[PDB]
Ligand binder design. Structure first.
Ligand SMILES: O=C(O)Cc1ccccc1O
Length: 167
């Protein structure tokens, strides 16, 4: 048993809810929250800008030190950093950004990072401002992640369409 509440069960291991991931993280304090990161860990908008704002910019300060030491992530890659006031850990995962021309086949590689963690609170990778088909992102999630994932869909109209189209 875990602390996640009000989720619709899609599969053995994937759950979904219409929720603000920031507000969900603040309530649950999950072991792992996933950030929709870019390779530079520049947290400006969407999930990253919202998560970073909720940490009072401490996520960005920590991220800048990580990049200064290690250089940029790979598209499809990840790193584990602090969850600050939101979670124990933040798994920063880089899905491909369609609005930068990145290979959508890298979305499966991105979701494979989730398998290193038994339970996660996450957004749909590459959805919204990343320019990919969200319905596609949910299918790749279900067909790739084997650990227990609680998806927070921010946009209500996107949530209802994802549920009503789910195979
Ligand atoms: O609603 C979601 O969860 C998907 C998403 C991600 C980023 C920006 C806007 C947006 O709708």
């Amino acid at each position: 048993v875990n602390s996640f509440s009000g989720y619709l069960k899609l599969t053995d291991n994937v759950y979904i809810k219409n929720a603000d991931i920031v507000e969900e993280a603040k309530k649950v304090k999950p072991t792992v929250v996933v950030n929709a990161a870019n390779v530079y860990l520049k947290h400006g908008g969407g999930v990253a800008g919202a998560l970073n704002k909720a940490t009072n910019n401490a996520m960005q300060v920590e991220s800048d030190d990580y990049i200064a030491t290690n250089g940029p992530l790979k598209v499809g890659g990840s790193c584990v950093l602090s969850g600050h006031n939101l979670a124990k850990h933040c798994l920063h995962v880089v899905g491909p950004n369609v609005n930068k021309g990145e290979d959508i086949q890298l979305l499966k590689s991105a979701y494979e990072n989730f398998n290193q963690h038994e339970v996660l609170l996450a957004p749909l990778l590459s959805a919204g401002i990343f320019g990919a088909d969200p319905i596609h992102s949910l299918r790749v999630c279900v067909d790739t992640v084997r650990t227990n994932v609680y998806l927070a869909v921010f946009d209500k109209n996107l949530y209802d369409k994802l549920v009503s189209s789910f195979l």
